[PDB]
Amino acid sequence: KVQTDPPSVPICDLYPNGVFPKGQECEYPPTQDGRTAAWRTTSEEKKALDQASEEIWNDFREAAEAHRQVRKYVMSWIKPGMTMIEICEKLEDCSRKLIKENGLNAGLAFPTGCSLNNCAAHYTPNAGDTTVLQYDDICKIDFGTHISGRIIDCAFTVTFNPKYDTLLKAVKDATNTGIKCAGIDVRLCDVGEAIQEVMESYEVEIDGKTYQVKPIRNLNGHSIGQYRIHAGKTVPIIKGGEATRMEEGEVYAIETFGSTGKGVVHDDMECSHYMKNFDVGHVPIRLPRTKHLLNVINENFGTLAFCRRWLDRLGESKYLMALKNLCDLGIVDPYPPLCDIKGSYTAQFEHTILLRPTCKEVVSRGDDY
Ligand SMILES: O=C(O)c1c(NS(=O)(=O)c2ccccc2)ccc2c1CCCC2
Ligand SMILES: [Mn+2]
Ligand SMILES: [Mn+2]
């Protein structure tokens, strides 16, 4: 009934009623004709629709409460001096328990991203990484949870030196502006346009030098499908236009990235993230090690992302060759770290939002951000 100091009680065991707490519920922003949505709030049909998908939203909520209670715990102990591995393992151990891990029914949506400084996304330590968090590092903690495939992609930036304060603020504000500007019938390009107006209205000072915060042009937000971290649509982050419009009932990961470098990321360092291609079908394989690894991936991760450590813990050993095979065969896709130029700094803020018929829900919102 009550959560223990160091979190240990599944979110499921904390709410005996089976109903989980909603996120921040906003009213879809108007348009040119000031077209308010004070009607969707209680329209008769839009209310029935929402009630129809009620169990889905509830799943997203059970996953968001896991995320909120885990990141809250991480913010109390993450300190420079700890290795990137100890950090991720302490974060995932807790996350496995609150979400009440259970095969594909409930678990960790993707690996724990702790991309450092100029690296903005997709870096997680591999066995052997001796990297230690430093007082001057700007670490992006990006991890996800899920219940029955309903994914919560939510992230924040951690720092210990205040010289980054105003940078985090630029990006946190850009992220919120994106969340606030999003909604049914809103064109992606417009969301990107705005996120950039705000983002670039900030300018910071770091170690004597001064920069105008830049959105990482080739990074962005995305729509979220069941067991599919990237459903299909994308949220710009800059003057990009895409060619689409957000629709009713969609789930989006709103995230923005700010940088002091070029505002462009590139594949860098060693690969840790991997994910079975959703579109790819059943391919027959006779090669032993490859066949067995693919079985492990289907059994433990489905089309959800994973990392080398997650293979290690399952007892898998010497599997890089088999992994490269699945990658070459196009069955598995590698997701390397995305880093901007050396010396630059980068920050991120992400939230998962539900575009429900009656109102817009920032399901992953919390006391913190
Ligand atoms: O970060 C993600 O949400 C993500 C993704 N989505 S994305 O292509 O929109 C993207 C967004 C931000 C940074 C990099 C990629 C696509 C594939 C993957 C991820 C995270 C885990 C690894 C696989
Ligand atoms: Mn993320
Ligand atoms: Mn994301």
UniProtKB/Swiss-Prot annotation:
GO MF, any single term: metal ion binding
Residues annotated for a divalent metal cation 1 binding in this entry: 142, 153, 350
GO cellular component: cytoplasm; cytosol; plasma membrane
Alphabetically ordered keywords of this record: Acetylation, Aminopeptidase, Cytoplasm, Glycoprotein, Hydrolase, Metal-binding, Phosphoprotein, Protease
TM ranges: none
Primary location recorded for the protein, binned into one broad class: cytoplasm
Positions annotated to bind a divalent metal cation 2: 153, 222, 255, 350
Free-text cofactor note: Binds 2 divalent metal cations per subunit. Has a high-affinity and a low affinity metal-binding site. The true nature of the physiological cofactor is under debate. The enzyme is active with cobalt, zinc, manganese or divalent iron ions. Most likely, methionine aminopeptidases function as mononuclear Fe(2+)-metalloproteases under physiological conditions, and the catalytically relevant metal-binding site has been assigned to the histidine-containing high-affinity site. Also manganese has been proposed to be the physiological cofactor for human METAP2.
Entry cofactors: Co(2+); Zn(2+); Mn(2+); Fe(2+)
UniProt: substrate binding residues: 122, 230
Domain of life: Eukaryota
Catalysed reactions, as listed in the record: Release of N-terminal amino acids, preferentially methionine, from peptides and arylamides
GO biological process, any: regulation of translational initiation
EC number, UniProt record: 3.4.11.18
Family: Belongs to the peptidase M24A family. Methionine aminopeptidase eukaryotic type 2 subfamily.
Function: Cotranslationally removes the N-terminal methionine from nascent proteins. The N-terminal methionine is often cleaved when the second residue in the primary sequence is small and uncharged (Met-Ala-, Cys, Gly, Pro, Ser, Thr, or Val). The catalytic activity of human METAP2 toward Met-Val peptides is consistently two orders of magnitude higher than that of METAP1, suggesting that it is responsible for processing proteins containing N-terminal Met-Val and Met-Thr sequences in vivo. Protects eukaryotic initiation factor EIF2S1 from translation-inhibiting phosphorylation by inhibitory kinases such as EIF2AK2/PKR and EIF2AK1/HCR. Plays a critical role in the regulation of protein synthesis.
Subunit-structure text: Interacts strongly with the eIF-2 gamma-subunit EIF2S3. Binds EIF2S1 at low magnesium concentrations.
Protein name, per record: Methionine aminopeptidase 2
Full-length numbering of the shown residues: 110 to 478 of 478
